[PDB]
Symmetry: D2
Subunit: 250 residues, 4 copies
């Protein structure tokens, strides 16, 4: 239906937000390849959504540049030319800037920043000039808009994704590539990332944090991603789509 | 049926953006009342979308405070409790701040700002605490994000709507009203507002203005409004949804 | 003397932030006219900063359009051509959008928005093309950047000032008028406005409001205005200068 | 005068913007250490401003992590505890995201992002809790606010610096460290970086780029840095100070 004919790569599509994006993309008629590092999780995730006629898992670390090439090749062979890239894989580290080790800094940036760069660069290269209505959806966060004292490297990575995506959006638009680039900025969402940080859900559910008084769910981010992947959003590029319970409005 | 059961007021819904919002709202299952000041244009507009079982026209100037209560009463008599208010009526004045007459200032603000205040205030009063999944969508502009040297009063109006809507969203969220408030920021859209302005489409299509090299169409704004009116966006409030061909990304 | 030769109008210059702006403007060599509604308060304020050779009080309500041209005339007759206009007069209303009466809406906007419009429009007309290094400083707020659930009309006015100022800045720059226009966005500041609201300073001093754990002082806003009025800022126009204890960074 | 008793490190302080920051810092009474990679240029730069009692050059690549500790030790041995860190060193690469090689990407980020991280992290460690009125000034750019189609890696780096600085600002504020962190966002400035790229100043001077119709000068950025280093800005933290001729206001 709303994504008829689309062919999407969703990185980190085996749990949490990415899993829900994959789920709703398939529901709307897209063919999907989901990636993650853990093949046990990934093969189960794909089967939980559908058969191999509509979704497949590829084991791939988003920080692995060479694997990105193989990932597009595998997706093309399975489903035809890629039309949609969701750079969603990402990790956190609970450290202030002051307390961030250089190893933590480089590791987080290798996934959250390099991975989004590799996927955006290759997405442009693979999808430009093909009349596909192509769309690159880069997962930022409210932490790409406001700071947090205890996620210094994470803040750096999400602010970089925010503005790098604008550069790509502009170049694709000016060159008539038929590729749009936008960023999505979730507020707190119930995912393993949040579930595995003790007390995170309670802290983020305070009204001083999220005015709605609760955190979101992965489908809240899947539905804005369906909009940005569909041709309904053919005039949206370089823009920031914030789904955050009011977090950044105060 | 993405808007199953919704009951919407769309101000200025007889031409341009508002007409397309009303069109796509009816397509997705909403009952709609459109407003405008010209009864013959408006009755035809309504009938062009559907019968009185799904859409009706009400003559009402958005700057008319007393008429806002009658407009809600009329819509609820027709279709039941209002769930969705799109404050779309608006006008432009091609004057710099320096050259703006006080008459022009007050006239434009009485529509673009007073009207949005009236609809937002009454929408909250009439829709809160009824479990309706209510949504107030306030039409700002890229001109609520950046300035334009020849639309001073318009800039003032669109920046007011931008931040006033955040106040409403926060209060509704904190009080558990089940009412969301967001703003939409179109870039240039082919409408009578633009068509009646000699040279405007040619000017806005320059790559230094809109990187996509063309202006949008009314459905481009309709589809983001369908997203915001639907329960798909139940975690989006107090946020800005920009559909502008890249205008504000550079 | 960083404001050597400057001649400044500071509306609402008899108490609080405006008083300190006037005070530091005189310390830096400017001649200053302060305005306010109450003559006993205003004559005492002017005298508390200096003599009539450097500062004078003029009774003028910023919402009074007719009084604006007389205010420029009086200042120029006293001190020579006006070079600097600080649109600082403003009022607050502690009401949600839902709870705002139309009288309260119109009244607040008549001061906070009309007054800034009147001073900016006249300031451009009377200062352009005279080699004065002219500067218009419009007092917005953090409430021009984020919403507050019980400051609806105030939010509307401060967002309007934010974007209307950009329009003016751009027109002046493109026409080589030698007039810059910028906005200042104070966070909470200890002033009679804040002193009169019982509990406001305690509430705004919580870390979830102001991360520094205390509110600012009027000189905090005076010093950014000195920078903006001086030729040090000859390349700054259309920009937002935020002095807020970290309030909007989280 | 305005920087009495301050002790500043200015990275990349031997040319362009950084040289002028150093020049005005010394004029206002600060002791300054400027860094650069080229020793002959650097010693001449320092001598051009003053003697070793007020300014000294230290050869240091901002991307060199271990050298940062030596740089702080050298500065403190010369002038006493560092109070002020200006992370100004930075490089550009004229490539779209699509055309950026991974080595170009890594190289630019090692200076523009890692260097700002290293200086901010160590600055907090070395200046907190000492009553210095410490200030960390991180040089972003208008390219941290909007995208540029031919500056992909640069855009990423400047957006990272923008939001990473908010994290640090908040942490320092919440912990009462007496350390402030802010970002400066120059528009086009006549410097060797701009001079050495053929067609830079001509293109940036077009009204569609810079509404003032000309680019800035290094002193334009020096003076906002003076304000941010001084105690005049003791209530400013986590904020963005834009000096860009109106570039981002349209
Ligand atoms: N949850 C929130 O509140 C929130 C809010 C705003 C933004 N975000 C952003 O949304 C995205 C998804 O977050 P989430 O909360 O859904 O995370 P999550 O629950 O931890 O899920 C992460 C997914 O990414 C995969 N993954 C982890 N590291 C990877 C790597 N190097 N390469 C490829 N895949 C990898 C995981 O699979 P494997 O473990 O098998 O690799 C898993 O499929 C992230 O970019 C995050 O920054 C989240
Ligand atoms: N077109 C663009 O490029 C653009 C871009 C950004 C934002 N916007 C915003 O989008 C909204 C719609 O713009 P548009 O371009 O579709 O305008 P448009 O083509 O002029 O259509 C205006 C609609 O509003 C109605 N209307 C005008 N004044 C009214 C009033 N006082 N009370 C009630 N209805 C009124 C008109 O009908 P009657 O004349 O019969 O009353 C018509 O139905 C406006 O808020 C505008 O500021 C437009
Ligand atoms: N204090 C804060 O926390 C804060 C934060 C951000 C922004 N602001 C803004 O900064 C500005 C100054 O606020 P403040 O806190 O210093 O206020 P304040 O202490 O109440 O002082 C207001 C000044 O304005 C004058 N005034 C009031 N209404 C006026 C009118 N209609 N025409 C001319 N003068 C008028 C008052 O004199 P009379 O009463 O004698 O007329 C007084 O001199 C306002 O724009 C406010 O919105 C304040
Ligand atoms: N110029 C503009 O239009 C503009 C606009 C906005 C922002 N900015 C930003 O402002 C900052 C200064 O730019 P600019 O135009 O003054 O640059 P510039 O004219 O090229 O000067 C750069 C200075 O940094 C030094 N430098 C270069 N690489 C370095 C490294 N790895 N470690 C330490 N020092 C290094 C240079 O000396 P050596 O070569 O000897 O090391 C020189 O002293 C940069 O962060 C830039 O991104 C510039
Ligand atoms: Mg906030
Ligand atoms: Mg722009």
């Amino acid at each position: 239906d709303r994504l008829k004919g689309k062919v999407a790569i969703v990185t980190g599509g085996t749990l949490g937000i990415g899993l829900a994006i994959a789920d709703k993309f398939v529901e709307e008629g897209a063919k999907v390849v989901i990636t993650g590092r853990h093949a046990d999780v990934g093969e189960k995730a794909a089967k939980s959504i559908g058969g191999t006629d509509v979704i497949r898992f590829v084991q791939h670390d988003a920080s692995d540049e060479a694997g990105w090439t193989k990932l597009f090749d595998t997706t093309e062979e399975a489903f035809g030319p890629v039309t949609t890239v969701v750079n969603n894989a990402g990790i956190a580290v609970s450290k202030s800037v002051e307390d961030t080790t250089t190893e933590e800094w480089r590791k987080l940036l290798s996934v959250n920043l390099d991975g989004v760069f590799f996927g955006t660069r290759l997405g442009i290269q693979r999808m430009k000039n093909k009349g596909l209505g192509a769309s690159i959806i880069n997962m930022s966060s409210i932490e790409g808009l406001v700071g947090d004292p205890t996620q210094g490297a994470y803040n750096a990575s999400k602010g970089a994704v925010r503005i790098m995506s604008k550069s790509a959006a502009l170049d694709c638009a000016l060159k008539d590539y038929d590729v749009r680039v936008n960023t999505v900025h979730p507020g707190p969402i119930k995912t393993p990332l949040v579930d595995d940080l003790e007390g995170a859900e309670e802290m983020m559910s305070q009204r001083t944090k999220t005015p709605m008084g609760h955190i979101g769910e992965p489908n809240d981010i899947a539905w804005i991603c369906v909009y940005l992947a569909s041709d309904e959003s053919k005039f949206a590029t370089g823009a920031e789509f914030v789904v955050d319970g009011g977090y950044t409005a105060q």
